[PDB]
Design a protein around this ligand. Structure first.
Ligand code: NA
Ligand code: NA
Ligand code: NA
Ligand code: NA
Ligand code: NA
Ligand code: NA
Ligand code: NA
Ligand code: NA
Lengths: 303, 301
């Protein structure tokens, strides 16, 4: 089963999940084994803190259960790592708001930009009217590309002049969305690396200004991160979560990267729902995250 | 991949998957909508019982999620109908036995013999040593067809005179397979429905004789059914499963039939893994079943 996701995770499966099988084959459970396993988890971008927790729990379980052969660690790992992902399994529900406001945060990258477009198309296919807000106001090329995308897809895009106040653009977009019976408003934001404190103050202002129109907005603060960036995804998540407060995460570019193990670090460190994973180029390849599908694809050696 | 499968399933997609889109466009979620959906599922040969389950789960899911637009039902249907197939998505693994024994069952006229030969060639191309047993002992053309596959591919075929005892042929074949270090043995069987009890008793006798040589044999009891026969495929599956017990299914002739929806009835009613699907007449057109490829192709918009 899960052959499509198994293909997307092919390179990640070399080191994690089914990749553990060759590591444990024929070995005893001892300090040397756990050192080798720790190294492999770290090379897979699982992260120091999450790896330490896995090793601690696995070591105690193997000891208490008096396990003898390393092969048995495979099933215990599937349980421990599966629980990590199950704890952040909760799909995004955008129903019943006028509009449901998604504030899209994260650093500048193809992932964030592409995710806005894919989600907009998915919501339209679900029968919802969508509007976009071009809140990355100092990057004229990014604003124009969003306007181009909206025109190509007949989705309205609210934008102001280069250098406009992002909170004002997004406020105006919420007003336009309410006036035009929009179901979902997706608001882009700046994602510049220099002067991190400035960006975080900008995001806090955006959120405060929204409350004049709807105390429930933003209904979702969604971070987009790129699995191929390894631990940079974790540090980005920490930065945005501590500054604004995330309610959902989209993790892109899981297909074709050997760094897919970072999903475990994101899940364990922050406990924020992972709403979607990107595993391909099609609109439909931005999938709602299902922890059971993911762990089975990762650990099963059958196709 | 899913994209290649789209062409094979075009006819089925008129009523299922992407065929749902026009049904939901612009509509509200109400009893009339679910009645219209029920009609479309039934004409696609999804079956009365499976259709009712789909509608019930879709209704409960739409209520739970507080959906407003019928368009949003499309994704829930993809999820729920995909779950039906995911439950029978375990691939066949023929490794590690001496030999792994596949007992092929089913009625005459569904291509059991040709399916055996195609699988035998595939296993050989994968590097496995294969042997075939001509257990459809009263049908000389079936024995000859199996021998043709064996002769073309240098695969041994165990056979006796027309009218021989099928259990004896298969017993001798298992003994020969063990003596010759064979990896996979595939046994053809009789398929006359005119006397259902006689056929099922013959199959049970074959199985009893196998177990005297290896308690694990047969490792797979595989049914072949023809998707273009609609609910006949479902009734055939029920007969063999309740009488003998199936562990895998090969579903042929999915390409060009508007009755491909029967796969959901087979999956839901019996829960037996669907190991392979046929989307053409060639060896290469008998593909390992991948439920996610199938759903993605069916629902692609
Ligand atoms: Na970590
Ligand atoms: Na309000
Ligand atoms: Na209803
Ligand atoms: Na499968
Ligand atoms: Na062979
Ligand atoms: Na032949
Ligand atoms: Na051949
Ligand atoms: Na058996």
């Amino acid at each position: 089963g899960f052959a499509r996701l198994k293909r997307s995770l092919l390179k990640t499966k070399e080191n994690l999940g089914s990749g553990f099988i060759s590591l444990f084959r024929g070995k005893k459970i001892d300090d040397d084994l756990f050192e080798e396993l720790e190294e492999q988890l770290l090379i897979a971008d699982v992260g120091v803190e999450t790896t330490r927790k896995i090793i601690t729990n696995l070591t105690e379980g193997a000891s208490r259960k008096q396990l003898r052969d390393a092969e048995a660690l495979y099933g215990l790992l599937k349980e421990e790592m599966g629980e990590i992902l199950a704890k952040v399994d909760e799909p995004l529900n955008v129903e019943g708001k006028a509009p449901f406001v998604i504030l899209m945060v994260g650093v500048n990258g193809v992932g964030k930009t592409t995710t806005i477009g894919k989600l907009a198309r998915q919501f339209e296919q679900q029968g919802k009217s969508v509007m976009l807000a071009a809140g990355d106001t100092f990057r004229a090329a990014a604003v124009e590309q969003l306007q181009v995308w909206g025109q190509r897809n007949n989705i309205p895009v609210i934008a102001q002049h280069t250098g406009a106040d992002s909170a004002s653009v997004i406020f105006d977009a919420i007003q336009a969305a309410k006036a035009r019976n929009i179901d979902v408003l997706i608001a882009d934001t700046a994602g510049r690396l220099q002067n991190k404190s400035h960006l975080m103050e900008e995001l806090k202002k955006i959120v405060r200004v929204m409350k004049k129109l709807d105390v429930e907005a933003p209904h979702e603060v969604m971070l987009t991160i790129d699995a191929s960036t390894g631990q940079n995804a974790v540090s980005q998540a920490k930065l945005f979560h501590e500054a604004v407060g995330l309610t959902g995460i989209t993790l892109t570019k899981l297909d074709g990267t050997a760094k897919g193990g970072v999903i475990f670090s994101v899940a364990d460190q922050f406990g924020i729902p992972i709403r979607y994973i990107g595993v391909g180029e099609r609109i439909e390849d931005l999938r709602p995250f299902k922890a059971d599908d993911f762990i089975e694809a990762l650990f099963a050696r059958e196709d």
